[PDB]
Amino acid sequence: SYAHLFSPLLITFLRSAHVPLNAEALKACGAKYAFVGVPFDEGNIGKPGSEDAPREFRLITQEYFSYWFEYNVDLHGKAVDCGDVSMPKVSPEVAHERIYRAVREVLKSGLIPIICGGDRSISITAARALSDHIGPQKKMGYMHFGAQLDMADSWAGERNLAPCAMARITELPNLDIRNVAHLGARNAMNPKDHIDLSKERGLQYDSMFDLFDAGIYPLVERSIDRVWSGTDAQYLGFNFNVMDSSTAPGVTSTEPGGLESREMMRIVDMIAKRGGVSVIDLTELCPIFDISGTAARLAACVIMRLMASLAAQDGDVIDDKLRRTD
């Protein structure tokens, strides 16, 4: 029935069905994406709040309809929600082990994990999962949006906190540095060793100033091509402090001088042109700092528009001629 497309006559992403975190159940359910909540923040060295993001994000998504008229796409059924990875507190070794297993398990199903943190360090283990999934004879690419490089070889004596995340990810043996993009870095939360390691490893990050200097889209397109050309799987990650402060207040560490929502919506379409992605993460939403749920809404529209734009690319559209009077 198509009643849900039209004006009328459980806490899950997009009001989607729950399916257990089980490869066989996921393979049989008919969906293309699987939402996984990861309320973990032991990687966070800044202000708390990310642990409530998965709940807030689900709830915001429940307010949109499944139909996206700009794309002539319905998302109903495209996703399901696996709930949350359950973690013991002050137990970081074992938390990461469980996250790793969960992402391997979704990947085994063939569905695309949508991983909602929680803090940015969860990317390390989700990325390592995709690395292991595809294995040493395939090539991965990686794209991340954020204001911070997170290129700390170590931080405060540790090696897997959020500021080390790219230093660990760029070490994955089937991620060639030339297939790695990092967009939006700016302002001062970027210590000199983050730059020095980048230059040492050849990480061709696109600073926010590089982006503005290039009119944004030309340089984004180049970095999309590096990540998607000649790669077998691509990991896409968001920290919405890539956005200007006014546009995404409810994040762990907001930064002035970022992207506008209209520029991110064009960037989502540019990504969608390549016709697929293997994993999607969003981390560092921080709903206690949010006004009218601005950051959560921005994130929800970005994720849903990427789903819808990918569907439109795949020609997976609704019949134009359907009318409420059927």
Partner 1 sequence: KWQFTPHQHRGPAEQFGENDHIYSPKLHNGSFKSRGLATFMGAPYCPPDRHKIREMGAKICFLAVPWDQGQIVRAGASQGAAALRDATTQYFPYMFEYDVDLLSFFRVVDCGDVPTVPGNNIKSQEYTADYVTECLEGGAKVILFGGDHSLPIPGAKALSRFTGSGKMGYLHVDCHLNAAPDWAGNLITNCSGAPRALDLPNCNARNMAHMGSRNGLNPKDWWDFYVDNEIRVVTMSEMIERGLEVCANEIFERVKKDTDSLYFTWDTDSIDISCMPGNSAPECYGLKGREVIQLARIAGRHGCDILDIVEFCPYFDPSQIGAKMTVNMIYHYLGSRAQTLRQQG
Q: What is the dihedral of CA 107, 111, 115, 121, to 10 degrees?
A: 20
Q: What angle do CA 286, 45, 212 make, to 5 degrees?
A: 65
Q: Under rule CB under 8 A, which residues in 50-69 are in contact with a copy of itself?
A: 64-69
Shortest Cβ 27–partner 1 spacing (Å): 28
- Tell me: does residue 69 bind partner 1 (CB under 8 A): yes
Taking the C-alpha atoms of residue 118 and residue 125, their distance in angstroms, rounded to an integer, is 13
- Tell me: does residue 12 bind a copy of itself (CB under 8 A): no
Amino acid (1-letter code) at residue 206: D
CB nearer partner 1, residue 123 or residue 253: 253
Q: What angle do CA 237, 161, 155 make, to 5 degrees?
A: 125
- How many residues touch partner 1 under the rule CB under 8 A: the total is 71
CB nearer partner 1, residue 79 or residue 102: 79
Question: Which residue from 10, 93, 292, 315 is in contact with a copy of itself, where contact means CB under 8 A?
Answer: 292
β strands within 245-296, DSSP E: 279-283
- Of 5-13, 31-39, 76-84, 109-117, the window that binds partner 1 (rule: CB under 8 A) is 5-13
Q: What does 44 interact with, of a copy of itself, partner 1, none (CB < 5 to 8 A by kind)?
A: partner 1
- Tell me: does residue 268 bind partner 1 (CB under 8 A): no
Taking the C-alpha atoms of residue 324 and residue 326, their distance in angstroms, rounded to an integer, is 6
What is the full DSSP assignment across 129-153? HHHHHH-TTS-EEEEEE-S-----S
Residues in the chain: 326
Taking the C-alpha atoms of residue 269 and residue 271, their distance in angstroms, rounded to an integer, is 5
- Tell me: does residue 24 bind a copy of itself (CB under 8 A): no
Shortest Cβ 268–partner 1 spacing (Å): 11
Site string (107-146) toward partner 1, x via CB under 8 A: ----------------------------------------
- Tell me: does residue 204 bind a copy of itself (CB under 8 A): no
- Tell me: does residue 52 bind partner 1 (CB under 8 A): no
- Tell me: does residue 25 bind a copy of itself (CB under 8 A): no
Name the residue among 7, 11, 232 with its Cα closest to residue 107: 232
Question: Which residue from 304, 306, 310, 311 is in contact with partner 1, where contact means CB under 8 A?
Answer: 304
- Of 7-15, 18-26, 34-42, 124-132, the window that binds a copy of itself (rule: CB under 8 A) is 7-15
- Tell me: does residue 153 bind a copy of itself (CB under 8 A): yes
How many alpha carbons fall within 13 Å on the CB side of residue 107?
Answer: 24
In the block, residue with structure tokens 């992207």: 259
